[PDB]
């Protein structure tokens, strides 16, 4: 993504303060609750009949953590999101059969999570940068789909 240098500096500054363990579990959980059709892909994660069932789900919690990890790494390579996520893009398509639209839903929910978390510190300009990143990521992930 073509992020200003203060965009990448701001994205970066904040990320350092995020607790990946948790944020990821919170982001993925909120996805499943807000857009329940996304649950289609996690039938083996057990109970997701309720918000508490979803948010406290240890599997959701565990999955959430791997996502954010991968996300974290893409952030070390803003200049090469596509190379970064190339293997994950093929997997999601060819093996997981996940519609790329889910990547966009997740990036927005993630933005709501970060906002939820940094409060006043998550300013308009910080958000603007974050949107760009999330979009870079969903596009990077949807790139090898065919």
């Amino acid at each position: 993504v073509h992020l200003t240098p203060e965009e990448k500096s701001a994205v970066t500054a904040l990320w350092g303060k995020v607790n990946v363990d948790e944020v990821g579990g919170e982001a993925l959980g909120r996805l499943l609750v807000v857009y329940p059709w996304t649950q289609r892909f996690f039938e083996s994660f057990g109970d997701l009949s309720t918000p508490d069932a979803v948010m406290g789900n240890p599997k959701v919690k565990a999955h959430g953590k791997k996502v954010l990890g991968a996300f974290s790494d893409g952030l070390a390579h803003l200049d090469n999101l596509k190379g970064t996520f190339a293997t994950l893009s093929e997997l999601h398509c060819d093996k997981l059969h996940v519609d790329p639209e889910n990547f966009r839903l997740l990036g927005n929910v993630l933005v709501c999570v970060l906002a939820h978390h940094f409060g006043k510190e998550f300013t308009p300009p910080v958000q603007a940068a974050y949107q760009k990143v999330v979009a870079g990521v969903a596009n990077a992930l949807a790139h090898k789909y065919h």
Partner: protein
């Protein structure tokens, strides 16, 4: 909301389709799969090659639903209620894809109804397809 003119327009266009509907269903899906590869994510269990019988079959099924939607233009909700449950509770097709097929269905129609595919019809069909889409995704959450 469909005006009485829209309804006329669509009843008209669709009456023209007649016995090809099925033909045209399968065609629109085909176009979809090739033009919007992402849409294939939902048919991992189908043969998607050109000529696929699975695709032909399903095409009919889709067509038949459109026909039915046409017949009940004034109570689409009731007529389609059951498909709404299915796409909402089982298929769980991201709402975005409805816009894709509607466009593919529209292209198809235009290629088979030179004469009838008028600006006014075009516009009425878009609206009818968007209403069908709206119905099918009304039970998502």
């Amino acid at each position: 909301v469909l005006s009485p003119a829209d309804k006329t327009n669509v009843k008209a266009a669709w009456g023209k389709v007649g016995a090809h509907a099925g033909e045209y269903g399968a065609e629109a899906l085909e176009r979809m799969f090739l033009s919007f590869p992402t849409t294939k994510t939902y048919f991992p269990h189908f043969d998607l090659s050109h000529g696929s019988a699975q695709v032909k079959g399903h095409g009919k099924k889709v067509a038949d639903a459109l026909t039915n939607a046409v017949a009940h233009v004034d109570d689409m909700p009731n007529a389609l209620s059951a498909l709404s449950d299915l796409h909402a509770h089982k298929l769980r097709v991201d709402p975005v894809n409805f816009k894709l097929l509607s466009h593919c269905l529209l292209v198809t129609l235009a290629a088979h109804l030179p004469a009838e595919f008028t600006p006014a019809v075009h516009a009425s069909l878009d609206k009818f397809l968007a209403s069908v889409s709206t119905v099918l995704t009304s039970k998502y959450r």
